[PDB]
Amino acid sequence: IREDLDNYLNEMGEVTADNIQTWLSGRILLIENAAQNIAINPEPAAVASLLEQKALTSTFMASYLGDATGHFTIRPDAKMPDGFDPRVRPWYKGAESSSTSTLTEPYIDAATGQTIISIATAAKKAGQSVGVVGGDLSLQTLINTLSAGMGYAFLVSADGKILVHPDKALVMKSLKEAYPQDTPRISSDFSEVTVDGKTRIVNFTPIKGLPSVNWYIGLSVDKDKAFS
Asked: Which CATH fold topology does 24-140 show?
């Protein structure tokens, strides 16, 4: 009854990881397509036109272009904080320093003030960059995708930082901070930990095929309700 829990958890981890990968992949492709189209014609009226299109506005909280002069275009348009400079934001630094698209860890959106992640990629016109295109996805949207019986899934980086968790208090806490006693180890196939008085078993599964990041799905399930 222990190698059936093990097999259950390893399989649900793989299914969860694959769901997240395919959910993110289509969104990454839209931002790459936006960056490719922006590189055709980076004039600001053309950029605005592209970012206003319904495929982007229905998929992302907003999408935007920032460039090396500090120019910024965001759609839907939104008053940015005084002094806003895209070149110092995490989406921008991540992407300008990557040969591929990127995904940020959670960070505080300058537009809305809520915690989000961004997909971002440099727009290159004959190898020369014309800026960084990004699109935003809310933390809640990610929580909702990870939660679509015995337990729950969370998203954790390969440094062991919890990135998306149904307990929002654990977002951006390391595994050690979040589980100070009996810290789940990504290096082991399973981990048992006592939480809320109950015993839980924890699995990690790498999410394949994501550009620039190395992230895992964590599965945490109650031992008792699952062993039964």
From this structure: Beta-Lactamase (3.30.450)
